[model samples]
Target: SEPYQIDIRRATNTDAWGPTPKHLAKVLRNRYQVPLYLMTEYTLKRLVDHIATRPKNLYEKARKDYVNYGSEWRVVLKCLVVIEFLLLNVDTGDELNQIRSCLLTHKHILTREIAQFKVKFSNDGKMEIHERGIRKKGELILQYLEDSQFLKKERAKNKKNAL
Candidate 1:
């Protein structure tokens, strides 16, 4: 089957699981360059483990809303935000690696989507997918890893210098 282009603005407004954070929406609609199908699927599955299992939790709310209204995209954004938060703020190497592996597995499909122009804007006024320098989802995740590792090394170096 041929790949289809998505109108990102409309999708953000109509398809998301709930109200999306502006920063997250930017990542989803503007920065993340993969096709919606690919991004949405990746986001939801990654979000599952992180979200709470109890009833009426944000995860449950998102799932309920998705089932009721066919909206699950915000769950994806929530996943992205949580992952970024964890990578930036915590020392969770093992957990981060698990998420990274998932991104790695789907890297080729994302690259192919970019190469084929399967993800795009409906109008020139919207954000351009290719301009952000992250050609695949793995690159974005790797950026977080690199930044986190660099900060850790710098901290260790500072502690050694102070001793």
Candidate 2:
């Protein structure tokens, strides 16, 4: 069996490319740990399904703030679209290979598409909203998650009796 660390590195950023969200990366490396180099479309679907269920709070946030979150939601949609497109086009290979192949093969087009997918928190003619309000809320929510996770880990470790 492969060590967890090795498995993490292998499954994550194996090609040293692509943009993966921090939380998603954490889940993949620590929780999922499914070797991406060997992942199939079914694997990705399972992960997506898990995301739909677990992290209920985050998913709730996504749903609740869908409108207020604005383009940030669209950015997530774009990412999903990209994954779908890659999956459909992939030949008989693993997820890692498909990612690398799509990124390299359709570099220009994909780059342009991804570049257009951005997060706008304030009004710039198209939308009218204050950034500071939501910005602080976002920070607080993220910080709360981090702090709670740290506390949970500490409590778990403390529960273990060791010499």
Candidate 3:
């Protein structure tokens, strides 16, 4: 009961949806010591919206081969990524490079998983009735792969390879 109460209070009062963006931005900047320019109202609104709308269930995420788990959760999660990135004090080119590289690494893992999945599931009849929409999920997964590939290449070309 104590843990549940703490979680409820924290969930409601800790993030963007809990506080106004101006105050949240100030907290990120003053407490987190990030830059002010990166904390635009547009970005703040996005963070608030993300925290406000994100699905609380982590295990229910969109798997590479699983769709209809609700894309809304995926969208909200992506927004959280952007907000967290902006919150960090990555002002220099080197810092930016590091952040991009980190994100690319994460994307790479997902891409590899998705690619393997696409190949493994390329054959038909393996999919169950519930897995019928996996093809659409496959398309979305490919998008992540493409973005990951592009960022990976871009970082390499810019000599920003953190790995």
Candidate 4:
């Protein structure tokens, strides 16, 4: 049996699924193992879906002078880092071919948020730390993804130049 059974559940039913719970993603994000989950397709899918739909205001923003701990945004960052690790360790495109499709579909959300990223803390010291280190890791993943698209575009361009 394969690791992810290739039944209709995975093949034909992306719509029927939902992203992992916030608490679950958060724990995975914070522990920082960047573990075997990188190779695990479903786990990556869950994290990707969370980033896809829920990662709008990823920077931690103060709500009413800091009652909101901003746990949600932290998880998104964690998942973003996880994805970076995943891309590096993964070899076969079969492993994450769907991941490219899914992320590209929602690429604008990630691209825009990152371009305008911020860390709303009371101290200026932490803001640089947040984007400098945290967002940088995630941005590296974005760069790889964009390059993947560019490679595919050039693949199609070859035919035009030949003609």
Candidate 5:
């Protein structure tokens, strides 16, 4: 007779998500100590690309597969914090409007994930802040975009340059 090879106390280790906005902000503040001018559209596009195509983290596969992904919140909220920090700690002109508008124009990347996700988690063990922060911070970004006319304004300027 033979028994299956299994450990009585097997365990799976979970890993933290990869390079994120926290890192970007870190470099901006301390590590590399970037000049505010570096916060250009090109830079934001990197984050926007990351947010648009967020890599998924594997969880489990059953009749219903379980998978985990880093929430856009990690980047969005964190980057938003950096930008706000720059404004509060630092500006009111070209670099100001440029960095400000970069996040605004990328609303498409954010709004979809905001409404499109209800992933897993919720029941008697409900935790509210995670999802709420995602939704709340997400909405505020767009609210600024709408109330003021950032996208259209950017496009109009771009068009003037025949862009």
Candidate 6:
């Protein structure tokens, strides 16, 4: 018999849950290393599923905070979360930090509480009381959220148009 040799390497699944195949292809192109690209299809599938479901983390964050910290601060933090998400599509951090800084500096009104309430709604942990007070605060917060979303969408649209 002719002399011969064989090579073998054990493979393991790193991500049990993965993303869609197309999503996996995109992630592989963007995030994974070439060496890792040598992985078996199973591994690739796992990686894909892992990334595909990754966006669930945002909803997961919402789920986690909505129950424990539904304060104005939490809603502010959620807006920041969405900002961070949009920022990810960009190539710089200067604007991102600016947004955060503005939020921090204006913590008084941008997200913090008004004078009507002695305690800071942004940082306050007190549950809503009285139908009128709660209704008023909710109306104000909803107004802010709507404005923020409107501005965000407008900016994103402008950026796309500019490109």
> Which residue runs of candidate 2 sit more than 4 Å off their true CA positions?
1-22, 25-69, 73-95, 115-163
Clash number for candidate 4:
0
By TM-score rank, best first, the candidates go 4, 5, 1, 3, 2, 6
lDDT of 3 at 3: 33
lDDT of 3 by residue, 57-154 (tens): 44433333343223322333333333343323334354444444443544533344322322122123343321333334434533443575653444
lDDT at position 32, candidate 5: 27
**lDDT of candidate model 4 versus the reference:** 0.46
Position 47, candidate 5: lDDT:
41
Q: Residues 99-133, candidate 6, lDDT per residue (tens digit)?
A: 33443444444233322333133224454442234
lDDT of 5 at 160: 63
RMSD of 3: 13.5
How big is the positional error of residue 56 in model 4, measured in Å on the Cα after superposition? 12
Off by over 4 Å in 5: 1-76, 87-90, 115-127, 148-163
lDDT score, residue 19, model 6?
A: 29
Q: Assess each prediction's global lDDT (C-alpha) against the native.
A: 0.39, 0.36, 0.36, 0.46, 0.42, 0.33
Candidate RMSDs in Å, in order, are 14.7, 16.4, 13.5, 13.1, 14.5, 19.1
Candidate 5 achieves a global lDDT of 0.42
- Expressed as tens digits, the lDDT of each residue in 32-144 for candidate 2 is 45444333333333323322432235556556534423333322332343343333333324543544443345443333433332234322444323233333333432333
TM-score of every model?
0.34, 0.23, 0.27, 0.46, 0.44, 0.20
Weakest 10 consecutive residues of candidate 5 by summed lDDT? 4-13
Q: Per-residue lDDT for 83 in model 6? A: 31
Best by TM-score: 4
Sliding window of 10 residues with minimal summed lDDT for model 1: 1-10
Output the better candidate (2/6) by lDDT. Answer: 2
Worst 10 residues of 2 by lDDT: 7-16
Name the candidate, 5 or 6, with the larger TM-score value: 5
